[PDB]
Design a protein around this ligand. Sequence first.
Ligand SMILES: NC(=O)C1=CN([C@@H]2O[C@H](COP(=O)(O)OP(=O)(O)OC[C@H]3O[C@@H](n4cnc5c(N)ncnc54)[C@H](OP(=O)(O)O)[C@@H]3O)[C@@H](O)[C@H]2O)C=CC1
Ligand SMILES: COCC(COC)n1ccc2c3c(N)nc(N)nc3ccc21
Length: 192
Amino acid sequence: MLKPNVAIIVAALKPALGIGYKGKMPWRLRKEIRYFKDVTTRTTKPNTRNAVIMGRKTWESIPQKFRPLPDRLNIILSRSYENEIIDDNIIHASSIESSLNLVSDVERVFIIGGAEIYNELINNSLVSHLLITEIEHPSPESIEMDTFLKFPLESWTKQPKSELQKFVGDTVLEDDIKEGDFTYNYTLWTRK
Ligand SMILES: NC(=O)C1=CN([C@@H]2O[C@H](COP(=O)(O)OP(=O)(O)OC[C@H]3O[C@@H](n4cnc5c(N)ncnc54)[C@H](OP(=O)(O)O)[C@@H]3O)[C@@H](O)[C@H]2O)C=CC1
Ligand SMILES: COCC(COC)n1ccc2c3c(N)nc(N)nc3ccc21
């Protein structure tokens, strides 16, 4: 695949854009996990599937029994990896672009974490779309967090919900979803 448009998908707590704590997610939002699965798995063309790219540490954080994530091509990046096809579902690579040379019959490509991957790849021109779940809490300061997004959002535009709906197709997008003390919304951003 030559120069595909890539999208980053992440869930972050406003206003600091915290994303983790001690190698884990600082929340358990059941509906958000379901959204993440639907958006990353659905395709429109026929014999296609999407690709999900993640850093080695995120891959290792998924219980062995539950990886690879089903119905998607999984790509794992490590600076110590040679570019190799493990099986039909797993690729090892040392750079996003080298990995893509090894794929065919992929519709969309998603970067799924973690922090180091996000913070570095946001500045790569292949990234054309950010799918950010904006999480709000009454006391964000009480949620322990150690890992944060460092995105230059002044160079990006938040689109109207209509544009997101067109992006996701069929997926149901509920507004102001509440789960315990958290309230969240799905958003789409594109470059200015
Ligand atoms: N809120 C959300 O939506 C999400 C949050 N997360 C959270 O992120 C945190 C985990 O993030 P983090 O620890 O930073 O780990 P990552 O998942 O980002 O893995 C980092 C590893 O990926 C490799 N790597 C990093 N950058 C590159 C690059 N540019 N090219 C090639 N390989 C690269 C290196 O592998 P090596 O060392 O082998 O060279 C590095 O050690 C946790 O808190 C986790 O829960 C994860 C996903 C989503
Ligand atoms: C398959 O699920 C694994 C978890 C954490 O890894 C251990 N997982 C990994 C990445 C994501 C994730 C994401 N990137 N974006 C949004 N919006 N929500 C998500 C929620 C669960 C996630």
